[PDB]
From a paper:
The shaft is assembled by covalent polymerisation of successive BP molecules, while the minor pilin AP1 (Cpa) is the adhesin at the tip of the pilus and the basal pilin AP2 covalently links the pilus to the cell wall peptidoglycan. In FCT types 2, 3 and 4, another gene, sipA, is clustered with the pilin and sortase genes, in a strictly conserved order (cpa, sipA, fctA, srtC, fctB) and its gene product SipA has been shown for several FCT3 strains to be essential for pilus polymerisation. SipA falls into this category of 'inactive' peptidases. We show that it has no peptidase activity, but that it is essential for polymerisation of pilin subunits in FCT2 pili, and that its function is likely to be conserved in all strains of S. pyogenes that carry a SipA homologue.
Here we describe the crystal structure of a SipA molecule that comprises the complete extracellular portion of the protein. SipA comprises two all-β domains that appear to be typical of the S26 signal peptidase family and is highly similar to E. coli SPaseI. In the present structure the 3-stranded sheet comprising strands β1, β2 and β10 is fully formed and presents an outer face populated with exposed hydrophobic residues (Tyr37, Phe39, Val41, Ile43, Leu60, Tyr62 Leu168 and Val170). The present structure shows that although SipA shares the SPase-I fold, the catalytic serine and lysine residues characteristic of active signal peptidases are missing, as was earlier suggested by sequence alignments. Although SipA lacks the catalytic residues of SPase-I, it retains the peptide-binding cleft found in E. coli SPase-I. Examination of the packing reveals that SipA forms an octamer whose basic unit is a dimer formed by molecules A and B, the asymmetric unit of the crystal. Two such dimers then associate through interaction of the N-terminal strand of molecule A with the equivalent strand of a neighbouring dimer related by crystal symmetry. This tetramer forms a horseshoe structure, with two such tetramers associating, again by crystal symmetry, to form the octamer. The electron density is indicative of phospholipids, with a phosphate head-group and two lipid acyl chains, which we have modelled as phosphatidylethanolamine (PE). Four phospholipid molecules, presumed to originate from the E. coli host strain during purification, pack together at the interface between the tetramers. An intriguing feature of the SipA crystal structure is that the peptide-binding cleft of molecule A binds the N-terminal peptide of a symmetry-related molecule within the SipA octamer.
Residue numbers in the entry:
A (entry chain B), D (entry chain B), F (entry chain B), H (entry chain B): 37 to 64, 67 to 173
B (entry chain A), C (entry chain A), E (entry chain A), G (entry chain A): 32 to 173
The structure:
């Protein structure tokens, strides 16, 4: 029904997505591993959904991520540490929200800083990428 | 001789050897240059009646070697492009350090643990390069 | 084995051997079929490390012959496609009548006076067909 | 990994797919509602997967289809009657097979004639369609 | 006046009003004709600052009417294109039988149960037609 | 400046152009061998310009065409005979007109029937062809 | 409401108002952004039922003025893009200095001697921008 | 017959052509205003043909260019001054050569430095440009 188009403008989602990528996203109920466009502070961001309503989200001392004890499907070539000004973990994911992580985990301004994003702040699932340079 | 020459090719990627830059199922476009390619270009190339993709890591006159800690050296310096893997030789490849011949390109899989690239074949002659991948379309598995 | 497979190719035509259907400088698009081609398709194909274009005049099991008046016969009947030229064998081609082998296509230049087509090479194996020309873009010389 | 390309050459799958459509299919484990290319008698066909190993497949007097009593997700603007030279129904779907139906149900030479197709005869799932005429 | 004119547009379909020919999420290409469109063309058109798609069911001078059994008549005959739905007027549309004006096209949703088409708006002037949908790309929901 | 787009709908210009071809034409002063869109009787046609203001146009008994005695640059695989209800030849081409011929010369409803076309009836030069079937 | 939304448009340029960046007869592609455009983008836009092209010289909140020597100032500084012409106001345009409104873009012809751009119309609301020209194909007149 | 493809890698031909442009060129007899790819010192360059065999090429004190007294068709927003290590002007263009100028005339390493280019060093006429960024 509703489709958006944007140019990715950070490397928060690298290497899955890079600055300058073109994306198409549509407004959806999301699923773990969906990559979504969302808004915080009148600013569009992209991130991947690591957890949904009810899950608990914990860290290991060795930079690892746990959703309900067990670590995630998706792997990234980074260690995941908490943000110091973020909610306490372990962290329970509220109804109507989704816990969102940057694939490039060294950028810690995702749900680890904001908490889970409410639905009304999620603009849609990215269904198509067109990369036209920097292959 | 020639009836027709390529300007572009539109292909689907069959392998994860260029992962994570490229994934199986990705659509790509390449364009064919009549002059030279460049370092870091991802190219489509042919070896053994077999189409392959890889990234140009060195060109004519360059010297390629490895450190004991799985690092790649081009002319004694480490390359621009970084990949989340270590690079080791193919035991049945040519000798290193390896002087890249005139008119050839030394091509590496971004997914370095697959070693069927120039580590096994040596550098590829230009005439076996089909073109440079300039564009990518991914629809699933983002 | 394969890194990548063609879905389309976008090419420029270098020859007038397919004239007047195709002219030098024409841009074309082809698509690659995994199954079989058909009679009257114009295809891009390779023989002797050389890309060529031509039109499929017969397929596996067909019989190709010539009349003394420069006419082509496929299975004893004249073909659908008409060209403003006569068709004669290549003196150094195979024998006719010619039984088209399994898994091959008998390909002819629309500009029949150029005889470096299946009249010289025999029928082409399918694996040497790159794809079917579906689209044409002409900008000059209309 | 392995991709095929073909031109649909019947209207067995109409309106979902029409003769002259171009498709891309890849070799997969299939799911109900997948549309797949398959071979019978050295001939490529396309059809949609209505049932999998273990299911039972039954007809109603009123041209309706039942998979395990309950009728299917996918609806088509045709009634589904059995083929007279086909297996008996109700019909239990063997392991390693998939029961395949034409969307255009008046063409009855699908699994209703052949039975369920074994995997080795399924060439792949159609993932992309390009229709270039007859829109 | 004009800086630029459309030759093609590449669009995504937002509605199921043209279902099953077209579905939400489909990609389409249209081309813009300078002359006339034809019956059965699916076109992109604008009404109320709003882009819409539909299929041309009648043209200038034609007469459109309905039977009591939900059938469409064009010039007293039923149309070529068949859809798996019945066609009824929009209670707030113009009168029928309806004489199609000069320079207009009478456009219908293939999914006839949605009646916001020419049954409500009347026939659309040509200058509000953006072009004809010639190509379709579907990737999900096949 | 002004561009038109049309679908060729005859084979008058075959093989150069075929029914179903897409063309782009722009409004120009034309030159011999230009292929142009023109109007006669509220109907768009296409043809190639064989002669301009001042030229004389004559036929040979052997189906040949003469512009000022000498035959044309462009050759076609047809013989060119006059139309019986057309102007007398030899035929002098008026100022402000262009003598237009069908490449497929067996269709004789070009300038051989109409005479030379005035400029105001020539809609433009075809600069681009896109053939999408029947190659 | 919407049946379909643009992702790309492929257009031909009818004017030399964007010369020498763009020329009459150029083919272009644009893509439609759902978010904001940027300064220096060349965009297709509509004003008075009329498609136009131009280059975004300023955005919301910016201040546009002219020097007596035919120079353009954006926020008191001269802009990045240089054109081989001088810029003067349109005598019947709005007042300058000109505060660019919220949700609008101040658009200028690269060929500045044609003044039917934001110098006459003011800044264009975003909803009247069709998209950004990203690609150019020139075949004649190079 | 023979087509080349290259990426323009200077702004010598700006604004007509810019670094990063893609071009198509074919091997030809050239004409004034043709833009051509040519080689000097095992290096591909592009330039526009200002004069041919027999012409004379002169400069005015006011940065202007004369071909046979009369200045050129093509205008550029630059003044044209000689190169100090180039041939003497006025300069007569030898048979079998073409006098080539950079559109961006402040780059003086064109025929003003090299003299006219022989044919065997001209690789072809640029017939198509594709600009994909920096519009
Ligand atoms: C096949 C080859 C595809 C050719 C497309 C070329 C246009 C690409 C282009 O350069 O646009 C660029 C990508 O933006 C985008 O293209 C944004 C849109 C991306 C959405 C992808 C959706 C694909 C459309 C599918 C419908 C197709 C239906 C066909 C029937 C951006 O250019 P820039 O210079 O401003 O970049 C600045 C930051 N990168
Ligand atoms: C955007 C507009 C798309 C333009 C494509 C135009 C080519 C279409 C064309 O006519 O080919 C036709 C469709 O076959 C096919 O095209 C077969 C291939 C279909 C597979 C679709 C996969 C899309 C490729 C995705 C990769 C893109 C990556 C870009 C970076 C068949 O022509 P005919 O005359 O023989 O027909 C005979 C029966 N219809
Ligand atoms: C590369 C491959 C090109 C893909 C184009 C595919 C669209 C072709 C398509 O089928 O449209 C068909 C041709 O009409 C036409 O396409 C009419 C327009 C032809 C004008 C050609 C001008 C080319 C545009 C150049 C600008 C490019 C700038 C890029 C930056 C007609 O379809 P149908 O089913 O109604 O046919 C009924 C009669 N044949
Ligand atoms: C319509 C939209 C056209 C889509 C084409 C998109 C591909 C463009 C692409 O990015 O390739 C870029 C241009 O090179 C080139 O594209 C080089 C080739 C240019 C020759 C143009 C000839 C056009 C072909 C005509 C035949 C068509 C026939 C159709 C039946 C270079 O990419 P990069 O990142 O390496 O750039 C590094 C320096 N810019």
């Amino acid at each position: 029904y509703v489709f958006g188009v944007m140019i990715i403008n950070t490397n928060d989602m690298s290497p899955a997505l890079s600055a300058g990528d073109g994306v198409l996203y549509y407004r959806l109920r999301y699923h773990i591993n969906d990559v979504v466009v969302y808004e915080v502070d009148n600013t569009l961001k992209v991130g991947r959904i690591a957890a949904q309503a009810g899950d608990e989200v914990s860290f290991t001392q060795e930079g690892g991520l746990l959703i309900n004890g067990h670590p995630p499907e998706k792997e990234v070539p980074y260690l995941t540490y908490p943000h110091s000004s973020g909610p306490n973990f372990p962290y329970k994911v509220p109804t109507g929200t989704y816990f969102i992580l940057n694939d490039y985990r060294e950028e810690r301004l995702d749900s680890r800083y904001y908490g889970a994003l409410p639905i009304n702040q999620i603009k849609g699932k990215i269904s198509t990428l067109l990369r036209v340079r920097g292959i």
